[PDB]
Structure 1
Amino acid sequence: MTGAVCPGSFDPVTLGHLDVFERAAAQFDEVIVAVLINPNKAGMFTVDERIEMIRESTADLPNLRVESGQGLLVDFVRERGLNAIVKGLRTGTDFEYELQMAQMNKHIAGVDTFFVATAPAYSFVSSSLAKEVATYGGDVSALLPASVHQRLLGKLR
């Protein structure tokens, strides 16, 4: 019966994200990873690539599925008969902005947002910082799932 949506651009998914997915899947009957797309900015990976990388690293989570979307997150959530968001916290999270969005999302659609801190080991990776470090040759292999790392290097070369 219970369920939550884990949203993000996941460009690419990191081990910080996967940690949060795993916790959500352990605590809710169903979890949907929402790959949210801005149709007006391309990013590094296509939607199909993003989804494939997530699926390949979540194969051990039977109650997790992955879908893309755009527009209001709360519409994505409600159209699936759910009303909870689970969002990860890491070092460098703009928490004040996350709080603003959470209060807005509850106001307009009655959707709750639960925050969970990612594991310390994965607390300083972000999609953007991983892409930046890898661009200049830094080793981010320990911070990304195998489904991502060499595809990332491929894009960069």
Structure 2
Amino acid sequence: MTGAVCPGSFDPVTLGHLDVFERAAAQFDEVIVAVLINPNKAGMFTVDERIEMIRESTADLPNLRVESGQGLLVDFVRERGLNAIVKGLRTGTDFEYELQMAQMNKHIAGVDTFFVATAPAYSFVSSSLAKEVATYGGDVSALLPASVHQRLLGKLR
């Protein structure tokens, strides 16, 4: 009955993201991870690579599935008969641009956004910072799922 969408670009997915997926899957009957693709800028990983990395590290979550999309998040959510977004947060500044988008999304489509505090251990990892650190040789193995780390190193090499 109940359900939420967990959106992001997940390029690549991090252990911070996985933490949020797990907590959403524990509290909602179904969870859809929404991999948002910009048709005008390729990330590091193709859509199929992003989805596979997420599937491989969520195999123990039976009520979670992964789908890509583009355009308005709230269209993705409503077309699936849902009206909740779950998003991970780190700081009060993350709460400002995110609050703006959450209130816009409620205004235009009646979709609710629930924020959850990331786990402390994973709180400083972001996809962008992990990529940037890995590019210049820093060790980010503890911040990313096994499904990701060596594929990341391969892309950089």
What residue is the counterpart of 2:145 in the other structure? Answer: 145
* Structure 1: runs of 5+ lacking an equivalent: none
CA contact (8 A) 1:91 1:123 kept: no
Structure ranking higher in helix proportion: 2
- Give the deviation of 1:93 after TM superposition: 5.9
1:14-55 Cα offsets, whole Å, 9 max, x none, are 000000000000000000000001100001000000000000
Q: Which of 112-121 and 84-93 deviates more?
A: 84-93
- Distance, in Å, in 2 between the alignment partners of 1:93 and 1:22 is 24
Which consecutive aligned stretches of 4+ in structure 1 deviate over 6 angstroms post-superposition? none
- Give the deviation of 1:91 after TM superposition: 4.9
Percent of matched pairs sharing the same residue: 100
* Aligned residue pair count: 157
CA contact (8 A) 1:91 1:124 kept: no
| Equivalent residue runs for 1:3-82 within 5 Å | 3-82=3-82
- Give the deviation of 1:90 after TM superposition: 2.1
Aligned CA-pair RMSD: 1.0
- Give the deviation of 1:95 after TM superposition: 1.9
1:46-105 Cα offsets, whole Å, 9 max, x none, are 000000000000000000000000000000000000000000012596320000000000
TM-score normalised over the length of structure 2: 0.98
* Structure 2: runs of 5+ lacking an equivalent: none
CA contact (8 A) 1:33 1:66 kept: yes
- Distance, in Å, in 2 between the alignment partners of 1:98 and 1:21 is 18
TM-score normalised over the length of structure 1: 0.98
